[PDB]
From Swiss-Prot:
The chain holds residues 1654 to 2092 of 3387 of the full protein. This is Serine protease NS3. Acetylated by host KAT5. Acetylation modulates NS3 RNA-binding and unwinding activities and plays an important positive role for viral replication. Residues 1-439 are cytoplasmic. It comes from the Viruses. The lineage of its organism: Viruses, Riboviria, Orthornavirae, Kitrinoviricota, Flasuviricetes.
Length: 439
């Protein structure tokens, strides 16, 4: 009603399962179409976008790939894209439309590109150019781990194995229904999934990189356990009876004591918002009344040292605005770290390189910023090899060595050390491909 008025930013914070995605958003879109508004819908991931455009099956929805920088048809159409696609387009295009209504679904997503998107959108709204709707059961500052739900949930607090077990946890395997198990890391998930698989359990693993291909498999009944990272907090719909949640995550932190680096701290306790979102995967079905949330430990609200707050600013400082509008993070997320105006603004080829390192090289934001602001070209991989001794990367205790594009053998020893590029087997493989200049 007033939600369509420019300069309004609405936080739709109805409880998990309430129907924000599948009933309320469709209504908003049908009404936006009636008012002839230029509408953008943002989904956390590709497969969720795919689920969104079936809830909107009657309507003129156009999914937008990030392989395309802009797509203007000149017709009445509603654009649908991932959070990251939007921020990627803002970094590389000028022809980003003046959407006057922007809905972010699952607006609790704390991935840097999502935080950056919210910052951008809030500013567009404040300019009087747009109205905006952020949809999430857990907006910034959320502290209630046990929000209301469609059907009753049994909250069971008990010990949960961190790794492979052999005895003392019969309740895990004797349970008769389907379970979603949130683990802090891919390695932790690998361990757990293999322990369950030896007992004859069918397991699907989910992480950020495999979500788009693995998540669809969970839509079948041909499984017993899902073992997932925090990616499933973003609007993932499961038909399950139980969540297991030791409430642990890894958190990237930029250390500034001496040589600046990114570590993965933890496992540490999750935020209340994360715990609520994990719990909120169950109790979704009014017909199904004895869902369980099995958990361990209390949340920790203070995530102020999380790298993602800085990284969002790095992105935002490089998305262009009129003069003199200053880029800024949205709402209370603005208060996570100290803002410094223009701190991360890059110019010329340094900026182009920054974007390319993230897009083409699939490098973390901080790492890309570090390389780009040193005046290093995208294709110049020498920095992968010229780090200090403590930056030597190890795989199975042994020193990782790389055959380079030019037919040279070099020890993998990056000048800037970001723990995320070797945090797991797939991450390390990718970084090895990058260091060898095969992308
Ligand atoms: N594909 C589906 N088929 C049948 N029911 C579904 C399907 N997807 C979702 N649901 C149910 O539809 C109801 C509302 O879903 P939804 O619109 O995603 O709620 P929500 O508010 O977006 N949840 P959340 O994002 O966790 O806060 C829930 O009971 C879901 O379990
Ligand atoms: Mn939702």
């Amino acid at each position: 009603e007033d939600i369509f008025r420019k300069k309004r930013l609405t936080i739709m914070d109805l409880h998990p399962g309430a129907g924000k995605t599948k009933r309320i958003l469709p209504s908003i879109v049908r009404e936006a179409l009636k008012r002839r508004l230029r509408t953008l819908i943002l989904a956390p991931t590709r497969v969720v976008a795919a689920e969104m455009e079936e809830a909107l099956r009657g309507l003129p929805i156009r999914y937008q790939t990030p392989a395309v920088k802009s797509d203007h048809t000149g017709r009445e159409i509603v654009d649908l894209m991932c959070h990251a696609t939007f921020t990627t387009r803002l970094l590389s295009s000028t022809r980003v439309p003046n959407y006057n209504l922007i809905v972010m679904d699952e607006a609790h997503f704390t991935d840097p590109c999502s935080v950056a998107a919210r910052g951008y959108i809030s500013t567009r709204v404040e300019m009087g150019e747009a109205a905006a709707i952020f949809m999430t059961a857990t907006p910034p500052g959320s502290t209630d781990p046990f929000p209301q739900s469609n059907s009753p949930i049994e909250d069971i607090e008990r010990e949960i194995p961190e790794r492979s077990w052999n005895t003392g946890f019969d309740w895990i395997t004797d349970y008769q229904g389907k379970t979603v198990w949130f683990v802090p890391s891919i390695k932790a998930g690998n361990d757990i999934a293999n322990c369950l698989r030896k007992s004859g359990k069918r397991v699907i693993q989910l992480s950020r990189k495999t979500f788009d291909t693995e998540y669809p498999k969970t839509k079948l009944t041909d499984w017993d356990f899902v073992v997932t990272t925090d990616i499933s907090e973003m609007g993932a719909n499961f038909r399950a009876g139980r969540v297991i949640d030791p409430r642990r995550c890894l958190k990237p932190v930029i250390l500034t004591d001496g040589p600046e680096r990114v570590i993965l701290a933890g496992p540490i306790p999750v935020t209340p918002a994360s715990a609520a979102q994990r719990r909120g995967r169950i109790g979704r079905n009014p017909a199904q009344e004895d869902d369980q949330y099995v958990f361990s430990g209390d949340p920790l609200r203070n995530d102020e040292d999380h790298a993602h707050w800085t990284e969002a600013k790095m992105l935002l400082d490089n998305i262009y605005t009129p003069e003199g509008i200053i880029p800024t993070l949205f709402g209370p997320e603005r208060e996570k770290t100290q803002a410094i105006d223009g701190e991360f603004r890059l110019k010329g080829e340094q900026r182009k390189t920054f974007v390319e390192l993230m897009r083409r090289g699939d490098l973390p934001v901080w790492l890309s910023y570090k390389v780009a602001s040193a005046g290093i070209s995208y294709k110049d991989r020498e920095w992968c090899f010229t780090g200090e001794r403590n930056n030597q990367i190890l795989e199975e205790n042994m020193e990782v060595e790389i055959w380079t594009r030019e037919g040279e053998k070099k020890k993998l020893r990056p000048k800037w050390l970001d723990a995320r590029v070797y945090a797991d087997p797939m991450a390390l493989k990718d970084f090895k491909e990058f260091a060898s200049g095969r992308k």
